[PDB]
Design a protein around this ligand. Structure first.
Ligand SMILES: [Cl-]
Ligand SMILES: [Cl-]
Ligand SMILES: [Cl-]
Ligand SMILES: [Cl-]
Ligand SMILES: [Li+]
Ligand SMILES: [Li+]
Ligand SMILES: [Li+]
Ligand SMILES: [Li+]
Lengths: 457, 457, 457, 457
């Protein structure tokens, strides 16, 4: 949180949003030198551009930031990369509501992110004042998003199942949450599907199970796909397909981040977090096409694609989650394969077995401007998962309906009587955009958290 | 054998074959109600269709089965899937000879097959009377074909080299045949080519060697390719190519099934069964392109395709078989690669080093309606197996003549003075056809067994 | 060296080079029978053809060899394959200079090469007299080239890191050079990049470090890529691409061969030879796309292609070489991928960080007729190696400039103040050409050695 | 040329290059306000960054431009995209020599380029003063480079053979050069290879032949590949491979641009420009693999790749050029296929049949900082062009040595006695770099022109 300043002072440099239509009238309120400079600079209010205005001394008086709209917020994410050095401040009066003011404060922080575990990088020299009224909420979100980005960005070699388990225990200690790690023989017996997928890796598979909160409160259970590296297994990926696969544990990072926000904000729920943590490797012990994998739910799965492993490990975590008849289950899973990204990289897919839940999450998406889109649990496609040998296959007969297929698979492990939402996310920025550096990224969480606050407070 | 009834009774429901041309005259011999019903039902004798005819009580009086011809037999294979519940019987008088009657009885049983090791399935409710005169032969064949289907259908995870060895020992116990298992260090020294192919798998390679019969009788030696799973090795298969690879031990299943029939029927031969049992895996210990593998025959093989492994392991089994100067050697091997299936999936390829043997097997094929087709050991193509480093390569320079190439490779290990037949089989039903459920399948065996009975009785 | 004779005699059969233009005048100097025979034979001096001329007894009098030019030399390489049996001799007077005479003597020997470790081969029956004045130089070169060919030709199974280390120790003993082998834990700590690449193989990685010569002499350090087998790693090669990969240690063979010539000829230098020896394997422990590998130079490398492993292991050897501030560093590395072979298979690429060195090597290439061609360390392409996570990536963003990219990568590990030459070589004959049998081959060494003799004597 | 100002005035805004090391001392010479502003802005001299400094009025006083070095020049190319509106000027005293001053002036203009034939674009608002002493040279180059960029950027539909011929005639009129267009039946008879390649297109093929200059002066003949669109023909390209193929006439654009500079600068030569202009299309009339194409040189070419068409059409233009025994022939051809771009996209390949010519062009490259690199006409690779049917094939047997192969093909049409240089160029900017907008680009020309001025003045 060193991109922010917390001691209030009367000498910070103001940053003011501006749109083209308001610039002429605003200039009329400024002195001669300011009017000449803004005109001489060529600044006209284009989104993402800035105009650094000098004092008569030559020091910086103010920075104008062109915005797409006064309620967009992400334009503020680009500030660290363009701002001159200094201590800056935003003005509450420049925003329609405290909510947009808080989003701008957070966007600034998100755009200041640099993953520096493997190379030295010069930190940005612009810092922003964070008012006490918004400090906890902005800090809680920034630190949680930074954690998600860090976990996804860490190379698989340094972020295997053990390291993921350690990260969960680190988060748990801050809130005295309890963590159980299911490994080796107990995993092999109790969670056979997690074991089958991860048994070929040099780093053994495990299940992370965290609990927190009042035992009398409604049970909210979060599940996240922790495939630390996905080679595809014997159905090996192409090089282009394998290049970003350190991110196939993005669902686990999201589930852990959401858990962290719930604990930071002390939501009145009984929280449980389940993360199957494995590597989908190629080697002498690899599970094979045609193999039948047993499950904790006592269903048999015929493996028709070793690279559709995420849903297989999630099936066991879900079977465990449902035993408690929780009030809500939410899972986060990363998408793999160019064709399965039906909604593109920046729009998480939502599946839900109950319409009220789906609609409430859609409403939350709009309120938070954290996009998501519902896809269907289209029942006729269950036929694509038909097996002549086992209860079902893990992948479909065709290259169509990939996303729906995975979600329908998981639905076999969750009763229609338990409210359940499944998120398919990309968890990565392919391009450098304001507030969104190339690499791991958090998505859907603000929407989900908003929903939880509305539902449980 | 629970699809059959063995206590003869006077109240079974008759099943009668019928062709369109005979239906009008047959109807003239029936009562009014029967004539009205057959006409009202729309049954006209189309192959595979049935007409269930009621008694005046509403119980079932008879079932007509449309047949392609009165000597085709496989139409009877579709009965379990369409018959109403009950105890049925065929009539010997409806067939030209006891041979067609027996084939119909067997086809019924073959179509009643359900592989249920991994899912619960409701058994068929129609059963057929099996007359005492045909009981042993039909049972012997049904149980042997079921065994072949079961072994092929079992996922590789549950059917590795050890499990295959156990299956052989189970069959051996019934006839007090002797079984030797060559493993680990002795295999590494004595059968280096079997070891090289299988050394990368987590389940180690072995050679199964079964013997039965009078030591004074003619030696018939059966050899079967037991590649429990074929990933292709470092020359990895495509996903479509690897999907059915649990079946790459189909040759071993066939050789074991043929051995079982020989023992059940007490053919007067000295039987030996040799099965190299391995997994062709990808891992740290995988044999590589360019590696030179030593053989039991003391020939060197340069590996030019790690996915042409079946012939490499068979070479050692054949080198062992020839040492005894047997009267006959027959090998069964499964085909891999869409392009190598020159005769399609339902027509086994036969290669033989002696013309009399090939012609006799062709004759047996026609007598049993168990199709096979001869392909040539075309000597000029030996040049395709030329190596600059070793005695020969294991695969050819081009993508043509795949089948011939494998057979010519094996011929280097078998003297022209020892009668030898090599069968390339697909061992799988891609589609659900009457009497032939999707999955593992037996082929060529009835023809081969007929030949053996004619030759050795 | 059994293709040569060392006891001088007056009854050897002369082999005489001939071009079409000189044949008519030469024939005029011969007897009637010789003139009739040469005309009757159809010999006209075409390059590579011969005319065996009889004595009146029917024994062989002389052999004419058609040559492309009197200074080409390689036509002599085809002699062992066409010569009748016997003891032959060349005539010094048939050559412009002793240099061409010596090249012809050597070419004869090079064309007599047969790799017979895995199959029996009949040796050639023609032998050539080697005069005492040229015996040491021709023998030194022939034995060194044979060694290079043998190491490259040996299948990877019989030429892993340990076997390569043993070969180096065998060469060292002859000259009492010292050899250190860096393995296991010390390698893991001190040469982490060599370890990361080779850790997945069943045969562990190591670094071979040989030293010889007067400690007061100029330091010449040779570095060679010893990838004993390259599967490509998780970014697995195609079968066609993996077929010749036993040759991916060709750079190590070249560096060892050059070291051997330096020691045989007692060049007044302080020689050091560094060979990273590893297998780039696929298995449970394989390094992955996205992994960040530490280096001896303390730079971080983001792995964007597991099949660009040679430069990664070389980086550690180079970082070690530079610590001594040597007078010269020369590395040899084999090319992988059809598209990276910009200069084709028979023209080694030279990169050098100092223009004088590059020009001197180019001059040496022309003097020795051992072809090489300079490619550029084009600095703007360093941008292709940009990483968002580490100091640099190991491979570029596109499929262009492959060779330049590898060389620029290595340049990050070598100061511009240390003269350094990097050779990208194919190290293999795809076709059987005179003096150049299919399989491993030595290239660039005569040019490099000539340069060293000119520079250090 | 509207990015430049030509009336000298005393009120232009100075643009001054600056490096980090000189900034502290420079600041010491400035007033208080300027020192405060430069420090407050965060400008430290990083290449490509600017610092707009205000006057006390708020108008712009000066712009500092960070440069990679004082002799690099391309940093000036980025100015139009970052400069505020205004009339600017450079200072001659800020450069080591008039040559670097002139390059900076030109780079500014090159970075102001916008291709607007198909969309409206706002022009840049910064203009630069162009001093009279450098006006002609800078204008001549800018207009010529703009022409090259425009021709390459024009979609193939609007830049077919006819449009290319029209562009040549437009350039010719300005200098009263003569132009002959060889079409239809005369082309079919006289230039059969140009006709064979282009006959399938809906826009017929032609040969453009321009002449200019004193008939007594040395003959310099320029040849350019005018493949207006390359589909690959029956050997059809992949979509990625065909996407930029409107640029396959880049060689023609280069040859025309070089011709234009020669005429603008009145070089004392007899200039001839030959451009085969065709579309390589797929349709009913497409030339085929295996077809033998006749040539103007009376050699036969067996077509082994319809997508190696550029060299086929160039062969006829070259055969025509050589008939006059010119003093020099220079051809420009665009590269096609990711693997053939051995030197990457930004480094043109030079081939030359005479060493003095190649060395002189290399020297010119260094003097002008217009990069090029020599590749070899490696004679042993002529064997790759062997045909069993015709005199030679148009493409090689392998996927290696692509560039060398094309150049060796062309060499069959040009005597070693005629000095000849062949340039393989990419002619496109894949990325937006300072002074180099995405799309068509000129390369190698400044080097070639420098050589011509040195050789012929
Ligand atoms: Cl990660
Ligand atoms: Cl099986
Ligand atoms: Cl080798
Ligand atoms: Cl164009
Ligand atoms: Li995955
Ligand atoms: Li196989
Ligand atoms: Li390699
Ligand atoms: Li082209």
């Amino acid at each position: 949180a060193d991109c922010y300043l917390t001691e209030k002072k009367k000498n910070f440099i103001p940053i003011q949003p501006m749109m083209p239509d308001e610039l002429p009238d605003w200039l009329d309120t400024q002195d001669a030198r300011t009017q000449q400079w803004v005109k001489a600079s060529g600044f006209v209010g284009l989104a993402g551009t800035i105009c650094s205005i000098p004092e008569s001394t030559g020091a910086l008086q103010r920075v104008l930031l062109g915005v797409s709209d006064y309620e967009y917020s992400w334009d503020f994410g680009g500030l660290s990369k363009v701002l001159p050095p200094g201590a800056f401040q935003l003005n509450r009066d420049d925003f329609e509501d405290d909510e947009y003011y808080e989003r701008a404060l957070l966007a600034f922080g998100l755009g200041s992110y640099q993953f520096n575990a493997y190379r030295k990088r010069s930190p940005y020299l612009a810092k922003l004042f964070l008012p006490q009224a918004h400090r906890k909420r902005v800090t809680d979100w920034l630190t949680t998003i930074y954690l998600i980005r860090d976990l996804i960005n860490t190379p698989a070699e340094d972020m295997g199942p053990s390291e993921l388990a350690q990260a969960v225990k680190h988060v748990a200690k801050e809130f005295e949450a309890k963590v159980k790690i299911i490994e080796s023989k107990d995993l092999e017996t109790e969670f056979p599907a997690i074991y089958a997928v991860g048994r070929a890796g040099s780093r053994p598979p495990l299940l992370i199970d965290l609990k927190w909160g009042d035992i009398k409160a409604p049970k909210v259970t979060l599940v996240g796909k922790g495939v630390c590296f996905d080679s595809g297994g014997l159905d090996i990926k192409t090089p282009g397909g394998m290049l970003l696969m350190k991110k196939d544990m993005g669902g686990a990072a999201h589930a852990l981040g959401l858990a962290r926000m719930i604990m930071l904000q002390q939501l009145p729920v009984r929280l449980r977090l389940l993360i199957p943590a494995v590597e989908n490797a190629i080697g002498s012990r690899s599970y094979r096409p045609g193999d039948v994998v047993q499950t904790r739910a006592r269903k048999t799965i015929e493996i028709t694609n070793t690279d559709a492993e995420g849903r297989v490990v999630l099936a066991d975590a879900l079977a465990e989650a449902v035993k408690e008849d929780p009030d809500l289950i939410i899972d986060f899973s990363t998408l793999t394969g160019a064709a399965r990204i039906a909604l593109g990289p920046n729009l998480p897919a939502l599946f839900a077995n109950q319409d009220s839940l789906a609609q409430a999450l859609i409403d939350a998406s709009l309120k938070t401007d954290d996009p998501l889109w519902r896809l269907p649990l289209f029942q006729p496609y269950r036929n694509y998962l038909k097996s002549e040998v086992a209860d079902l296959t893990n992948s479909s007969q065709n290259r169509m309906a990939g996303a729906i297929t995975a979600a329908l698979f998981l639905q076999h492990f969750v009763s229609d009587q338990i409210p359940w939402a499944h998120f398919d996310i990309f968890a990565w920025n392919l391009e450098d955009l304001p507030g969104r550096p190339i690499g791991g990224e958090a998505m859907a969480l603000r929407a989900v958290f908003h929903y939880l606050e509305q539902q449980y407070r």
